[PDB]
């Protein structure tokens, strides 16, 4: 129940 | 006369998606090839817009953060509008922000059903 997405990291 | 500076429509573009679901985009892009990109809307708190791109049969997702009258998906640079953000990645590889990715915007989601 949380936004994963790609993200810069 | 020549300069079309009389109200710009972002929906007119083929890469402008509406209120699409997460599971949908996954299946929709599943049929599409690499290089396909799109931007959907989401009624979230910190995030307002949502971007998606296909690369090596992998549907990636990018969160869009819009605050202080500015738009930006990362926490380093800022943009004046979605257009500036899109055109930036449309020509420049995403590797700059996402080292894991190295693709760019070429074809929309509604290009060929």
From Swiss-Prot, chain A:
Superkingdom of this protein's organism: Eukaryota
Entire-sequence positions represented here: 1404 to 1412 of 1544
UniProt modified residues of type Phosphotyrosine: 5
Assembly and binders: Interacts (via SAM domain) with INPPL1/SHIP2.
PTM per Swiss-Prot/TrEMBL: Tyrosine phosphorylated at a low basal level. PDGF treatment stimulates phosphorylation. Tyrosine phosphorylation is increased in cells that are in the process of becoming attached to a substrate and that start spreading and flattening.
Native source species: Homo sapiens
Protein's cellular compartments: Cytoplasm; Cytoplasm, Cytoskeleton; Cell membrane; Cell projection, Lamellipodium
Coiled-coil blocks: none
Protein name: Arf-GAP with Rho-GAP domain, ANK repeat and PH domain-containing protein 3
Gene (name only): ARAP3
From Swiss-Prot, chain B:
Tissues where the protein occurs: Widely expressed.
Start and end residues of each SH2 domain: 15-109
Superkingdom: Eukaryota
Modification after translation: Phosphorylated on tyrosine residues in response to FGR activation.
Function: Guanine nucleotide exchange factor for the Rho family of Ras-related GTPases. Plays an important role in angiogenesis. Its recruitment by phosphorylated EPHA2 is critical for EFNA1-induced RAC1 GTPase activation and vascular endothelial cell migration and assembly.
Subunit organization: Interacts (via SH2 domains) with the phosphorylated form of EPHA2. Interacts with SSX2IP. Interacts with NEK3 and PRLR and this interaction is prolactin-dependent.
Name of the featured protein: Guanine nucleotide exchange factor VAV2
Organism (species): Homo sapiens
Name of the encoding gene: VAV2
Residue window of the full protein shown: 659 to 771 of 878
